[PDB]
Every structure is written in C-alpha cells, then in structure tokens.
Amino acid sequence: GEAPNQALLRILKETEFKKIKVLGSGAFGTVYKGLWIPEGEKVKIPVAIKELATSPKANKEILDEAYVMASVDNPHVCRLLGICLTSTVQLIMQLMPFGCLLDYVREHKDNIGSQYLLNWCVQIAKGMNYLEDRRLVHRDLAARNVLVKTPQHVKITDFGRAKLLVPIKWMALESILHRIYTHQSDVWSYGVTVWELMTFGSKPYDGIPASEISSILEKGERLPQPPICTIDVYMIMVKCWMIDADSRPKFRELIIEFSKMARDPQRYLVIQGDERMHLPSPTDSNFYDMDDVVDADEYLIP
Ligand SMILES: CC(C)n1cc(C(=O)NC2CCOCC2)c2cnc(Nc3ccnc(-c4cnn(S(=O)(=O)C5CC5)c4)n3)cc21
C-alpha cells in the first residue's frame, strides 16, 4: 500500500558528543548546545541535543518524533542526525544558532527588511510542500517551530505531532471542531505563521482565551492586516483562512506567489528604512577550537 521507509536510525555513543550549555527549556523539554566528534572522522559538528524524567511514556513520544525526523530530507526541513540511548532518550540534531524565527523577528525587528520576510515565506512554503510530497501533516506549524540556521536560511522542525495523511490559535476550524487534520489545515497554520512574521512576532488573538477562538472564527473574524502588509500579502493570508479547505491555496502556489513578490519586495511590504538594513551573513567577521568544524548540512552519512 505505502512504500517501505528505508531511513537509517543512527545510534550515537554518549562518548562521541558533549553538552556545552542549555539553549532553551520549557513545555517542549530541554535543548542543549553541543559538539559531535564522530569516530576517527576528523570532524567537529555543532549540534542541538533534545530531551523532553525517566518515564516510559516520554521515551515513547520522543521515539515517535525521532521516527518522523529521521525520515525527512530537504533543505527547508530539520532532519535527525541520530539518537543517544541513555535513561532518557536524547535527539541529536543540527545546531540552528539563531534559534527560533519567532524570537528572531521580535529581537531583530529594526534590521528585518521586506526581502528577508518574503524569502522566509518561500522557504517555509518549500519545506511544507516537501512534507506534503512525503504525505506528512505537520499539525503544529508556527513561527516558534521554524528555526534559523543563518538569517537567510530557515527550516521547519518539531515533528512531535506530525502524522501521515493543543495550539488552537494556529489551527484550522475543522481541526478545532472535528480533529480533522490535512495538508490544507497545515495551510491555515502557515497563514498564522506568516501573520507572526509580518507583525514581528505578535501573539495571534492576544488576550482572547482559546475556548473563545472557534466562535470568533465561525462569526467570520480573522487576524487583522499587519501595518507593513499590502492588500496583496494580506489577501494571501486571508485565503489560507477560508472555511472551505479546498479553497485555501496549496503550498506549491504559496511558493509561486511569495517568489514573484520576493523579486520586487518593496512593492509588497512597506517598511521604514528598508534596503538600508543589515543582518549577519556567513561572509562577515566572526560569524563562525574552530578547526575541523563542519556544519551538519555538509556532513553526509558515516
Ligand atoms: C530551544 C530551541 C528552539 N533552540 C534554541 C537554540 C538557540 O541556539 N538559541 C540561541 C539563539 C540566539 O540567542 C541565544 C539563544 C537552538 C539551536 N538549535 C536548535 N536545533 C534544532 C534543530 C532541529 N530541531 C530542533 C527542535 C525540535 N524540537 N524543538 S523544540 O521542542 O525546542 C521547538 C518548540 C521550539 C527544537 N532543534 C534548537 C535551538
């Protein structure tokens, strides 16, 4: 019926990698910064180590996440490097040194221009289109779940809820009412993600309890038009929030729409001091022991 999943699950020795410091902690668990020094391979790979107490239910959930994360392979999606089998199972992933996109847009607002915002939209749509090709429904797309490798390269992560074909404020109305999840319900969440970027990290429907959201959507209320957004960009966000799921754009169409806009960004987003803004590039001073350091994107198979 469905094709065999021949993805390799790499088991990494505790001795092969080190924790440096905690990068973040919360409901999602705890994520540490680290260095992976494999075999006699003469490489140092910057890594992120995730662990969501030693309980069998936690280990079951993180292995479900590992299953999905080891099965993906796209430049705009985060792949699992391996797992470490300690009392609590750890996920070994690529270090995304600029953290999540949500915090990034709040912290770097004054230096984020139309080109960056539109390019991020294309990249998120590319990653989501890839997950659709792989018949995977994310079920938790949000700006918090998009990580920043460099300011010009973002990837989708957090496969903890991903399934083959509760964040109410990012959910499609069918998802809230009937628990119906599809690629088109992911498109709704994509629209909310775009709204989060265009508002430089605003909280969707702020102050409104999650219990009131379904009723607000049924009345026909939607997230407001962000100040920087032209009707062209807002109309796209609005189509992602249509009641009829089949009336919403497809990720392949969102790639096209945002790409055309990305060719003339100042026509589609109005930002004071645009094009005069600067963000860190891998061609800048002190962007990167240093010797033998290889990014995970350049470290292919053992
Ligand atoms: C706490 C997290 C968001 N974090 C903060 C980082 C970091 O470097 N932060 C610094 C940024 C610059 O300022 C100082 C902190 C950082 C760097 N690299 C990764 N690496 C990956 C790669 C692939 N997947 C994941 C992953 C999967 N699930 N989750 S999660 O459960 O945490 C999800 C809800 C968000 C993360 N992490 C995660 C990182």
Side-chain angles (χ1 to χ4, degrees):
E2 302 289 309
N5 187 347
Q6 295 186 94
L8 300 176
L9 180 68
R10 190 164 180 171
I11 309 294
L12 312 169
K13 288 152 86 172
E14 203 180 22
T15 58
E16 258 190 345
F17 67 90
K18 60 173 265 264
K19 285 187 184 82
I20 296 159
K21 51 179 141 194
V22 171
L23 291 171
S25 200
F28 59 87
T30 170
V31 181
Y32 308 87
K33 191 207 193 299
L35 258 192
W36 176 33
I37 306 160
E39 299 275 302
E41 267 256 42
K42 212 178 153 285
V43 295
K44 296 180 172 77
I45 306 127
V47 294
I49 308 154
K50 196 194 176 166
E51 51 180 24
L52 47 96
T54 310
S55 57
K57 212 157 270 184
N59 277 328
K60 185 232 149 52
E61 293 190 347
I62 208 159
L63 287 167
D64 281 338
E65 180 167 343
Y67 180 92
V68 184
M69 213 183 170
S71 304
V72 296
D73 183 33
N74 183 273
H76 295 114
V77 165
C78 287
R79 189 193 150 262
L80 187 77
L81 306 183
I83 60 169
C84 182
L85 298 183
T86 41
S87 44
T88 58
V89 171
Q90 304 172 105
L91 298 195
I92 295 95
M93 319 162 299
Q94 181 186 24
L95 182 73
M96 303 296 278
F98 294 86
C100 72
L101 199 43
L102 180 67
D103 298 336
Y104 191 84
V105 299
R106 293 167 171 179
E107 284 158 33
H108 295 98
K109 167 164 55 270
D110 294 352
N111 280 289
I112 294 159
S114 57
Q115 192 68 80
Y116 274 92
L117 290 158
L118 298 167
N119 284 354
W120 292 334
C121 291
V122 178
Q123 292 179 23
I124 303 151
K126 273 180 178 184
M128 287 313 295
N129 184 69
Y130 168 77
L131 297 174
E132 184 168 354
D133 284 344
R134 282 294 338 281
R135 308 172 89 173
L136 283 174
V137 182
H138 192 286
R139 301 180 59 239
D140 197 15
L141 178 56
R144 67 185 172 266
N145 292 333
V146 179
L147 306 184
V148 192
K149 175 184 170 181
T150 68
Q152 39 279 321
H153 191 168
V154 300
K155 299 183 194 192
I156 296 148
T157 199
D158 202 335
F159 295 104
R161 281 167 51 84
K163 277 171 147 198
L164 293 165
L165 187 77
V166 175
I168 287 113
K169 284 167 180 191
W170 283 264
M171 277 156 70
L173 189 70
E174 334 78 81
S175 305
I176 306 168
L177 299 175
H178 310 100
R179 297 176 142 140
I180 298 164
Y181 290 92
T182 185
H183 300 299
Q184 296 311 103
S185 66
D186 274 354
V187 165
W188 182 296
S189 309
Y190 173 87
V192 187
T193 308
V194 173
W195 186 90
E196 287 183 278
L197 305 186
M198 303 304 179
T199 56
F200 302 99
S202 290
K203 291 166 181 184
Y205 325 96
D206 192 36
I208 294 154
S211 68
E212 283 182 34
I213 298 297
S214 71
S215 187
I216 269 154
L217 299 171
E218 282 182 290
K219 287 176 186 88
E221 191 177 326
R222 291 307 182 267
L223 289 162
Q225 183 170 348
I228 70 150
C229 288
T230 57
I231 180 164
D232 300 73
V233 177
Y234 186 53
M235 187 81 67
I236 292 174
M237 282 156 51
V238 163
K239 287 162 177 188
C240 291
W241 309 320
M242 299 278 258
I243 290 298
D244 178 39
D246 279 1
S247 284
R248 294 175 198 151
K250 276 134 178 176
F251 289 122
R252 69 161 306 271
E253 299 173 338
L254 294 165
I255 297 164
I256 290 159
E257 287 316 296
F258 282 105
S259 286
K260 288 181 189 172
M261 293 195 301
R263 278 169 155 258
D264 190 18
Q266 305 196 91
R267 187 182 169 173
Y268 301 102
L269 301 172
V270 186
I271 299 154
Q272 276 191 26
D274 214 341
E275 308 286 315
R276 308 196 103 130
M277 283 164 175
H278 168 71
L279 293 169
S281 189
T283 49
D284 292 0
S285 271
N286 293 276
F287 185 90
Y288 299 118
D289 181 63
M290 286 265 281
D291 294 292
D292 309 317
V293 169
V294 183
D295 186 274
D297 288 333
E298 286 79 57
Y299 184 72
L300 287 328
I301 91 153

